Scaffold this active site. Structure first.
Site, PDB file in Angstrom:
ATOM      1  N   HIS A  58       2.165  -1.988  13.739  1.00 27.03           N
ATOM      2  CA  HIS A  58       0.560  -1.954  13.735  1.00 27.03           C
ATOM      3  C   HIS A  58       0.255  -2.912  12.719  1.00 27.03           C
ATOM      4  O   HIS A  58      -1.117  -3.463  12.876  1.00 27.03           O
ATOM      5  CB  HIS A  58       0.515  -0.965  12.728  1.00 27.03           C
TER       6      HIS A  58
ATOM      7  N   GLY B 247      -2.874  -2.386   2.001  1.00 22.67           N
ATOM      8  CA  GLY B 247      -2.022  -3.210   1.956  1.00 22.67           C
ATOM      9  C   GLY B 247      -0.218  -3.248   1.143  1.00 22.67           C
ATOM     10  O   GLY B 247       0.669  -3.941   1.263  1.00 22.67           O
TER      11      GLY B 247
ATOM     12  N   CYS C 170       1.800  -0.430   3.005  1.00 24.04           N
ATOM     13  CA  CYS C 170       2.627  -1.368   4.652  1.00 24.04           C
ATOM     14  C   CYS C 170       3.432  -1.412   4.843  1.00 24.04           C
ATOM     15  O   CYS C 170       3.638  -3.025   3.625  1.00 24.04           O
ATOM     16  CB  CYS C 170       1.490  -0.414   5.248  1.00 24.04           C
TER      17      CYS C 170
END
Ligand code: WTE
Ligand code: WTE
Lengths: 305, 301
Positions: A41, A143, A145
């Site tokens: 993503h 932030g 991920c």
């Protein structure tokens, strides 16, 4: 003596964390050999996260659409592909700090260390358990991920988790390093919720043994219980059933302390029926379930990695 | 979101851990530049542990009596000196993995990460707090002496603890990296005990703010308290007094959440009086006191 929720030393993993940027989205990547792994993503805009077509979005992006930064050095991307929910970016340089590593898929009840990262830089490390409902109770801000979870066996890093999302209850969901989600979640911003979370019974028992090893024994008793009778109680308190395999795994601790597993089950059964009666165990007023039997043996024997 | 007992990443410290052997004693050393730091009791014999004369013992040693091993490489010791309870071994090689580092002496209530090591090899990392009685509640086995505690700010490691001993209640005592003990303890195996352990009140209040920041408000109430009245009550639960300095430090969290410090103090008074009544706060059924106001701000923002 003493007993703490201990994480694996993180140095081997710190050397693999990089920053990945696509458009306006910036998150963390895992740089191993000549490939950088990150959540797929990363190619989504704030508006493409609602009903993404990852096939379509990826087809429209090129190698130059991805900016990879290892420290202050910026890695040339020479290829890109998708495996399930992880994006794989080929770079023109092998990570000289690549440790010995494997990709492993963990099962519920198993523990691992999380290296929380922001902008490619490691910020903190903590020990977690994969919950029976396949979530983890982590600590992550935006932030984060691409942060990874791992174990260390001998001198080999086993990567088992990559962080993808937060569920409305504040719990977290992610994938293995092959991009397969843990639990019935999808990497989309649609309404999702985790199932009822249960307690990892075999881990609670292991922790009771750790407590005995450290001198906490007010909860012991003279009684024993059968596995079938115990499971009847456990299911009523949202405890996972205890299998004969679980009992076998606790054998080492059962011998070290001289307390039979079914005797500890009787102790645990009573703790469930009566509570802890204003007493604590190893400094906790709750029954702790994020220590596996191996964790207890490992910490009580000083195993190094 | 979420809130966990989080340690600093340990890589910068892992690259500094070595094994130090003197006679039959083997423990951990900290290799920074061309100096290895370790507890001075590595030079003790099995009979010298009650009343060692460390000055006299060290005078009798030569450089070759110390065996330092960085991985599978032996470091040549070319000098040795003592600073308080820490031994300093000069080696002929500067550690190429030396990070930017400082030596700092922390105060009770301050938190730090411990890298537990055995035979120079790290086994685990966990977060600790210096207790008001100058002990730490660690996890340490035989062979763990020389393990260090640290913080990391930017890329600079601030070393604040080196482990030396265990006291009868299972708690731990050590020194700063200048070799000065925290608390009144000494590196002798004569009878010693830590004073009564109290709760770090300012840290409990910071953690209650973290709970509110994370969406938990069930423990708040409509009351406020004076600072004096709060301390009169808290001390009855073996809580440390809260000073005006502590109130000032909680100012930022008070502003972020819109809850006055003395209003949160009133909530804590009630929590001590009633317990949790089967509820948890940030996943705990006890009031946690090993998160500082700085820790809370860092983790929640
Ligand atoms: C580190 C050592 C010593 C040699 O090699 C190492 O790595 C240990 C760490 C300690 C062991 C378990 C976790 O923390 N330090 C010592 O053993 C230390 C050595 C002294 C300072 C010369 N002695 C102790 O910690 C004593 C308790 C002990 C001793 C041996 C052991 F295996 C476990 C625990 N503590 C002590 O001497 O003072 C407290 C005391 C003494 C008498 C009565 C009451 C209280
Ligand atoms: C494309 C998505 C998967 C990006 C991902 N989305 C979510 O985590 C959201 C929750 C969230 C958390 C913090 C925020 F600041 C914003 C959103 N999950 C979600 O929407 O679940 C479905 C749902 C349920 C109920 C109502 C509506 C929708 C994402 O934001 N990943 C973040 C990291 C990002 C995304 C891209 O770059 C990053 O680092 C990590 C978050 C932050 C804290 C832990 O998880």
């Amino acid at each position: 003596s003493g007993f703490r929720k201990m994480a694996f030393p993180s140095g081997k993993v710190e050397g693999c964390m990089v920053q990945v940027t696509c458009g306006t989205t910036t998150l963390n990547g895992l740089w191993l050999d000549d490939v950088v792994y990150c959540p797929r993503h990363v190619i989504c805009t704030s508006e493409d996260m609602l009903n993404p077509n990852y096939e379509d979005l990826l087809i429209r992006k090129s190698n130059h659409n991805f900016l990879v930064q290892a420290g202050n050095v910026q890695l040339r991307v020479i290829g890109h592909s998708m495996q399930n929910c992880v994006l794989k970016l080929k770079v023109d340089t092998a990570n000289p700090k690549t440790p010995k590593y494997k990709f492993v898929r963990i099962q519920p009840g198993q523990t691992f260390s999380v290296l929380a990262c922001y902008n490619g830089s490691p910020s903190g490390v903590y020990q977690c358990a994969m919950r029976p409902n396949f979530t983890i109770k982590g600590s992550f801000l935006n932030g984060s991920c691409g942060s990874v979870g791992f174990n260390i066996d001998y001198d080999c890093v086993s990567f088992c988790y990559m962080h993808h999302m937060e569920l409305p209850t504040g719990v977290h969901a992610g994938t293995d390093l092959e991009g397969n989600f843990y639990g019935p979640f999808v990497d989309r911003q649609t309404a999702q919720a985790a199932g009822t979370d249960t307690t990892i019974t075999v881990n609670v028992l292991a922790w009771l043994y750790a407590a005995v090893i450290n001198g906490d024994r007010w909860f012991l008793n003279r009684f024993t219980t059968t596995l079938n009778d115990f499971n009847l109680v456990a299911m009523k308190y949202n405890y996972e059933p205890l299998t004969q395999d679980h009992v076998d795994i606790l054998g080492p601790l059962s011998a070290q302390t001289g307390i039979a597993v079914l005797d500890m089950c009787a102790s645990l059964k009573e703790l469930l029926q009566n509570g802890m009666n204003g007493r604590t165990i190893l400094g906790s007023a709750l029954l702790e379930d994020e220590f596996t039997p191996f964790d207890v043996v490992r910490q009580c024997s000083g195993v190094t990695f």
